[PDB]
Amino acid sequence: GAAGLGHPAAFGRATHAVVRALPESLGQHALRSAKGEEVDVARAERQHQLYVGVLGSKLGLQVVELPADESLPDCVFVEDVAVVCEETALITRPGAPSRRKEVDMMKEALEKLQLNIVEMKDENATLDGGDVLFTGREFFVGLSKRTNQRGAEILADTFKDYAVSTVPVADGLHLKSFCSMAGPNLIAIGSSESAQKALKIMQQMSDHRYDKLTVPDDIAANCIYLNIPNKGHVLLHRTPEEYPESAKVYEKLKDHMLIPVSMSELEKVDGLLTCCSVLINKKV
Amino acid sequence: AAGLGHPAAFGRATHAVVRALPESLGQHALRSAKGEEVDVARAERQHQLYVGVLGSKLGLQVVELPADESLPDCVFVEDVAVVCEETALITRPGAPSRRKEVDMMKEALEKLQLNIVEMKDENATLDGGDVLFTGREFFVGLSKRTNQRGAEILADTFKDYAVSTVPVADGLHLKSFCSMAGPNLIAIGSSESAQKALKIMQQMSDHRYDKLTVPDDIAANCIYLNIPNKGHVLLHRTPEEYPESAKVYEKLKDHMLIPVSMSELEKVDGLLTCCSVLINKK
């Protein structure tokens, strides 16, 4: 019953998505926060293809698919190299120096989409897109092992229409390792002490209180909210096969079109749902 | 061919292990190329007809394992075990997510009272689809799924038979373009890939095999059985699917030819040999 909320300028409206195929080198060579199980690269490819099929085939977005680069094992995680807000694209300077060559082809793709490009070139600045939470009315930027204060300052200078606040992020995480937007004014949030401390800080800094959807698995707090024509609220979330008790929480969004999306292989290299796309609203 | 019936003939089987396909196969099974949408209900009907050939028509005792929705490729039981005489090699599939399929196959082959050997070496991979047993020796394709260590463990397991390796290209298995069509008879595709592999196989062997060349590589995958009171039996792809290849099989005048549809499972590279493990219990 959310279909009445379809609007060309609604929060979460997108027309285009940029994604990038994963290389075979991802299985052995992609960075990961913990030693774990062997990545099944063929299964990861199939899951990525299904994720792309949701964005393009099921939801109707125009998907730009960048080719894999075997020398960039993390290149599937396009979120980290660009932040798009309205008509402006910030090309980031990733915290991991070997990922910085990923920005070149993202830049070309976003230039083709007629976006206004700003490049993070300050040699003292790092920022991963995964540390950036855009709520629809402000930005929160995680200060992490990958994103620093200067990177957040450049983001604030680039997106002059929005307030920007920083939040400290622990250990080897990104801000969106445990949160994301699940709808207008609605933050999905994990249950760990790290996640709860972070939400407390963002709530205290903001002009207004966000609603929250608390899930028991931090990783399952990473979802993709979209507002799609003739549907309204749409949410991609981790499957009940992967995280049954978090999927049950999302089931309460009775006016959302809920789409379960498997990501069990890329999870092994810290790849969550938001990581694998950059969303753009090209207003016609 | 009926006079060729013998409990020790090449291709004699008494039992088959198969596994039902899960609903998740349609969207989640691995596949070599993007293609058409899988019709899962039609795939299931086709699998049921295949099982009916092995059990009802040909009289094998069929062990039917249940589908696991978490293992979308689990219907393809060939890849997880190779059986030779009274010995079963439980393989270590090339795709790591498929390795949990071995558990229930291992269980089934123990109830059949076979000698079980498990490929556990963390450096070894082997898909049963890469293994051609000719009745005289093994050929093992070195592919994106099967490596040298896997073939060595196969050779150490089946000590009564010579084992030789053959390079396999792309996203293929050795039996993506060949299979046994009868005693000393290899069905082989017409492509340059298939012909080069057959040439290598013939150079390494003590003796020359007879061949049956089919114009469609995929239709060179067939199942040969020696069945009591029948002799030569062959399951092959239908004339509706591969008319030019079915014509070639129609030349086997002393084989009982059984056309078997596999049009849906072919979309995820599932051919005839993939869907069963055959066993001869004396």
Curated annotation (Swiss-Prot), chain B:
Pfam families in UniProt: DDAH_eukar
One example of a Gene Ontology biological process annotation: positive regulation of nitric oxide biosynthetic process
Activity at various pH: Optimum pH is 8.5.
Residues modified as S-nitrosocysteine: 222, 274
Modification type N-acetylalanine: residues: 2
GO MF term set: amino acid binding; catalytic activity; dimethylargininase activity; metal ion binding
Summary of subunit composition and partner proteins: Monomer.
Protein name: N(G),N(G)-dimethylarginine dimethylaminohydrolase 1
Organism for this UniProt entry: Homo sapiens (Human)
Gene: DDAH1
